[PDB]
Amino acid sequence: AIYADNSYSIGNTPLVRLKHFGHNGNVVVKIEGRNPSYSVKCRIGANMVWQAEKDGTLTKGKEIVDATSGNTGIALAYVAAARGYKLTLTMPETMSLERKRLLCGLGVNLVLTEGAKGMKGAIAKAEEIVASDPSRYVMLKQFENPANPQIHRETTGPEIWKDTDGKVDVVVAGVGTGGSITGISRAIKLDFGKQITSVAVEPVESPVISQTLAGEEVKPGPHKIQGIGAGFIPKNLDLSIIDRVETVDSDTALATARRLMAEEGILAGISSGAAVAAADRLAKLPEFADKLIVVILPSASERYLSTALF
Amino acid sequence: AIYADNSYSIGNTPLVRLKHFGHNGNVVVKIEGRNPSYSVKCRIGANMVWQAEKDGTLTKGKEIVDATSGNTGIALAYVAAARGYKLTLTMPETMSLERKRLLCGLGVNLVLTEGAKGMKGAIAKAEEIVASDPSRYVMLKQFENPANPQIHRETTGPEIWKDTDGKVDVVVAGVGTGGSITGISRAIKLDFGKQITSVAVEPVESPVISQTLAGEEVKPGPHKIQGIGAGFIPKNLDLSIIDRVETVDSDTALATARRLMAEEGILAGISSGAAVAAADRLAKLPEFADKLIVVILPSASERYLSTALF
C-alpha cells in the first residue's frame, strides 16, 4: 500500500457517529478533510487529470488552466505538482494574501486579474489563455466534467456502502458542482440497488435548486457558506437522483460548524456546518428517526481561520 | 467501520513514494496530516485520555490541564470535546491570535499568562491549577507519559509494517517528545523482529541528542523547526533504540517543505521538511541505496500559513 504519488492516496475517509446531533446516533459524518489537499476536491483533482490523460487530452508538456482560488484550485495544484504539470490559475488581484501564498507554495503560476472584473475577470482570462494556444492548454471544467461525479461513484459512494455495511438510508450533501451527491447517489442507488434518500443542501440565501424544482422564480444571492450555492444549476448535479432539497442559512451553518468543533471535536469547515444542520433537521423527523443518515463534511476548519467561522 | 467518536478515527495514514528525493523511489513518507486534529499528536491525544480513563486517573467530571498551544494542545482539545471533558490550556498572552482563535473554536478554556514569563509562565500556572484542586485536575504530561510511545507501538509502527509488507529498512523521524520514533522503533524491532535503522532528527541549532550521545557539552538553542528540538532529552525518547542522529538546519527544513509542496504536491509542515532533508541525505549514501526509507511527516502546511514556510 505505497501510493506512487499523492494523487493515488485520495479518499478512504472515515465515518464518525455524532453525539449531539440526530437521535440515538442516527447521524454519521464522512470527513473529507482527510485528503491530500485537505478537501473533497482532491478526488476530482485526481480523477479529472487521470481521465484527461487516459483520453489523450492531457499529455506531457501540455499545461492546465483554471479560474479557481478555492478547494478545486488547491486540489488541481497538488495533483499538478505530483504529476509534473505546470498549472495556471487566474483570480482577481483582490484575493486573500493567504490563498495567494498557499497556491504559490504549491507552485501554481498565478495570474492576477483586474479587481473590478472580479470572478468574471478570471474566467475570461483563462478562456483567453486557452485560445492563445489550444494545443498547449487544457481547462478541466469542474462544473461539467463527468470525471467529477464519476470519481464519487467509484470511491466516495462505495466507501459509504462498505463502512455502513449497506445500512446507509440517507445521504446529505451540500451542492457546489453537484459531483458528490451525484456520484454517491448513482453508486448506492444504481450499483448497489438501495433506494436511499438523496438530500441536496443549498443556502437559503441562494436556493436556486429549490426554486427550479418548484418552478418558481430563480433568485440567486450572496451568502457565506463557502463551497456551495454557486447561484445556478451546474451540469454535474443530476436532478433526477435528488429526492429532497434542504435549505440552510449562513448563521446556522457557521454556528453548526462551531458546535461540531466545540461539542464533537470535529474540525469542519463552513459547508460542513450547513450539511449537518440540514441532516439534524431530517434526523429529528419521526420519518427519519430509525434511519442511518450519512453527511459529507467537505473540508477542515483551519482553512477558514480568516472567515466568520472564527 | 463507524467510529464512536473522533478519537477512535486516529491513524491509518497513507504512505506515498517521493519522486524528487532519494534514489529510485527508496524514500517514502507517512502523512500524519491525515488525522482528526491534522497532526501526529492526535494519536497521543486519543491514547493519553483513553489510558487515563482505563487506569481511573480521568473520570467523569475531572478536568484536563496543560500548557501547550501546539499540536498536542490541539489534539487534546479535539479529544476533550469528543469525549466531554473541559480542558484548560495555559499559554503566554503573547501567543498568536490564530491559535487563540483555533483553540477557542475547540472550546478550550484558555488561560493566558504574563507575556514576560513566556513558556515558563504557562507551565507554572497549570501546575498551580492542578495543586489548587488535585482531585479535580489531571495533567497528562506528553513528555513522560508512556501512553505517548505506546500508541505508536500499537498503531503507527504496525501500519508501517503492514503498508510496506515488512520491507521497511529505515525509519526517519524528528524528535519532539520522542514518542513517534520510540513507539515505531519498538514495534518493528521488538514485535516484528526486524533490525531496521532508527534515525532521530533534530535541529543543528539545538543538537542536544547528538551532543549527549557524543558526551559533548549540551548546547540547546533557538530554531524555527516547529514541533522538534525541545532543547533537552525527553523521557519519551528511548535512546537505546536510536541508531543514528541526523541534524538539519532551519533553512534546509523550510526549503525542503517548499519542495515537498511544489514538486511532490505534498502539503507538509516545517518539521516534515526537516525529516525529509535528513532522509534524502541517507537515501543518497550507497549504504542506504537499496533500502526502503520511511519518513514521518508530522503535520500539514496551512497550519504554518503565518510562519516562514510562506
Separation in Å, CA A272 to CA A140, A259, A266, B68: 25, 11, 10, 28
Q: How far apart are CA A264 and CA B11, in angstroms?
A: 18
Question: A114 lies in a domain?
Answer: yes
Query: Chain B: residue nearest A28 by CA?
Result: B2
Q: How far apart are CA A97 and CA A106, in angstroms?
A: 14
Q: Given the C-alpha cell 509562565, which residue does it identify?
A: B121
- What helix, strand, coil percent values describe chain B, rounded to 5? 40, 20, 40
The kind and range of the H/E element at A161 are: helix A157-163
In terms of Cα–Cα distance, which of B298, B31, B304 is closest to A102? B304
Question: B260 lies in a domain?
Answer: yes
Range of the domain at A211: 6-40+145-304
**Three cell numbers, residue B113:** 499568562
Contact B109, B86 (CB under 8 A): yes
Is A129 in the same domain as A156? Answer: no
Is A260 in the same domain as A247? Answer: yes
In terms of phi and psi (left: phi > 0; alpha: psi -120 to 50; beta: otherwise), the region of B165 is: left
Is A87 in the same domain as A208? Answer: no
Asked if B78 has any chain A CB less than 8 Å from its own CB, the reply is yes
Contact B277, B12 (CB under 8 A): no
DSSP characters for B214-264? Answer: TTPPP-----S-TTS--SS--TTS-GGG--EEEEE-HHHHHHHHHHIIIII
Is A215 in the same domain as A188? Answer: yes
Q: What is the DSSP letter of A187?
A: I
Residue in A78, A81, A302 nearest the CB of B102: A302
DSSP characters for A34-92? Answer: SSTTSBTTHHHHHHHHHHHHHTTSS-TT-EEEE---SHHHHHHHHHHHHHT--EEEEEE
Separation in Å, CA A224 to CA A69, A179, B81: 16, 21, 26
- The edge-to-edge listing of strands for the beta sheet with B27-31 is A2-3, B15-17, B27-31, B292-297, B168-174, B197-203, B244-248
Q: Which residues of A50-63 are buried (b: 16+ CB within 10 A; e: fewer)?
A: bbbeeeeebeeebb
**Three cell numbers, residue A235:** 451540469
A37/B267 CB distance under 8 A: yes
Classify strands A109-113 and B109-113 as parallel, antiparallel or unpaired. Answer: unpaired
| Technique of determination | X-ray
Q: How far apart are CA A95 and CA A115, in angstroms?
A: 9
Question: B310 lies in a domain?
Answer: no
Contact A234, A145 (CB under 8 A): no
Which residues of B are known catalytic residues? Answer: 41, 271
Asked if B305 has any chain A CB less than 8 Å from its own CB, the reply is yes
Question: A115 lies in a domain?
Answer: yes
Go through chain B and tell me how many residues it has. 310
Question: A309 lies in a domain?
Answer: no
Query: Chain A: residue nearest B165 by CA?
Result: A1
Sign of the CA dihedral running B218, B224, B225, B227: positive
Q: Please, which residues 36-65 of chain B have a Cβ atom closer than 8 Å to chain A? A: 36-38
Q: Given the C-alpha cell 472564527, which residue does it identify?
A: A310
Question: B309 lies in a domain?
Answer: no
Separation in Å, CA A30 to CA A7, A276, B7: 19, 11, 14
- Chain A residue numbers with beta carbons less than 8 Å from the beta carbon of B276 are none
- Chain A residue numbers with beta carbons less than 8 Å from the beta carbon of B77 are 265
Is B60 in the same domain as B128? Answer: yes
Phi and psi angles of residue A256, each rounded to the nearest 5 degrees, phi first: -70, -35
Amino acid at B228: I
Asked if A256 has any chain B CB less than 8 Å from its own CB, the reply is no
CA angle B161, B165, B168 (to 5 degrees): 60
- Chain B residue numbers with beta carbons less than 8 Å from the beta carbon of A6 are 16, 264-266
Is B160 in the same domain as B271? Answer: yes
In terms of Cα–Cα distance, which of A39, A11, A301 is closest to B81? A301
Phi and psi angles of residue B300, each rounded to the nearest 5 degrees, phi first: -105, 160
**Three cell numbers, residue B296:** 514521518
CA angle A240, A245, A250 (to 5 degrees): 140
A34/B35 CB distance under 8 A: yes
DSSP characters for B221-232? Answer: ---S-TTS--SS
User: Among residues A104, A124, A139, which one ends one of the domains?
Assistant: A139
**Three cell numbers, residue A211:** 426554486
DSSP characters for A97-142? Answer: HHHHHHHHHTT-EEEEEPTTTHHHHHHHHHHHHHHH-TTTEEE--T
Q: How far apart are CA A162 and CA A155, in angstroms?
A: 10
Contacts of B19 (CB under 8 A, 6+ apart): A5, B25, B263, B264
Q: What is the DSSP letter of A200?
A: E
Is B225 in the same domain as B244? Answer: yes
Is A97 in the same domain as A179? Answer: no
Is B86 in the same domain as B215? Answer: no
Number of domains in chain B: 2
Contacts of A29 (CB under 8 A, 6+ apart): A15, A16, A18, A266, A268, A272, A276, A294, A295, A296, A297
In terms of Cα–Cα distance, which of A149, A105, A213 is closest to B305? A105
Asked if B33 has any chain A CB less than 8 Å from its own CB, the reply is yes
Contact A157, A188 (CB under 8 A): yes
The HSE-up count of residue A213 (CA atoms within 13 Å, CB side) is 15
Query: What is the nearest CA distance from B302 to chain A, expressed in angstroms?
Result: 7
- Chain B residue numbers with beta carbons less than 8 Å from the beta carbon of A33 are 38
A31/B9 CB distance under 8 A: yes
Residue in B102, B258, B265 nearest the CB of A82: B265
Q: Please, which residues 171-210 of chain B have a Cβ atom closer than 8 Å to chain A? A: none
Contact B252, B225 (CB under 8 A): no
CATH number at residue B95: 3.40.50.1100
In terms of phi and psi (left: phi > 0; alpha: psi -120 to 50; beta: otherwise), the region of A24 is: left
Contact A199, A245 (CB under 8 A): yes
Question: A1 lies in a domain?
Answer: no
Contact A80, A86 (CB under 8 A): yes
Annotated binding residues of A for pyridoxal 5'-phosphate: 71, 176-180, 271
User: Among residues A98, A124, A139, which one ends one of the domains?
Assistant: A139
Phi and psi angles of residue A64, each rounded to the nearest 5 degrees, phi first: -105, 140
Is B299 in the same domain as B219? Answer: yes
B309/A2 CB distance under 8 A: no
CB atoms near residue B281 (< 10 Å): 17
The kind and range of the H/E element at B198 are: strand B197-203
User: Among residues B91, B114, B139, which one ends one of the domains?
Assistant: B139
Substitution target from B260, B261, B304 for chain A, most A beta carbons within 10 A:
B261
Q: What is the resolution of this structure in A?
A: 2.3
Is B95 in the same domain as B196? Answer: no
- Give B211: exposed, middle or buried? Use CB within 10 Å, 0-12, 13-18, 19+: middle
Is B184 in the same domain as B162? Answer: yes
Q: Given the C-alpha cell 475577470, which residue does it identify?
A: A121
B265/A105 CB distance under 8 A: no
Intra-chain end-to-end CA distance of chain A, in Å: 38
Annotated binding residues of A for hydrogen sulfide: 6, 34, 267
Whether A132 is catalytic = no
Question: B230 lies in a domain?
Answer: yes
Contact A266, B6 (CB under 8 A): yes
The HSE-up count of residue A2 (CA atoms within 13 Å, CB side) is 20
Separation in Å, CA A37 to CA A28, A42, A60, A72, B60: 23, 6, 23, 9, 37
The contacts found for A289-293 with CB under 8 angstroms, 24 or more apart, are A289/A23, A289/A26, A290/A26, A291/A26, A291/A169, A291/A170, A291/A197, A292/A26, A292/A28, A292/A164, A292/A167, A292/A168, A292/A169, A292/A170, A293/A22, A293/A26, A293/A27, A293/A28, A293/A169, A293/A170, A293/A171, A293/A172
- Chain A residue numbers with beta carbons less than 8 Å from the beta carbon of B1 are 14-15, 162-163
Query: For chain B, where are the alpha helices, taking DSSP H only?
Result: 42-54, 71-83, 97-105, 118-132, 147-151, 157-163, 179-186, 208-213, 250-259, 270-283
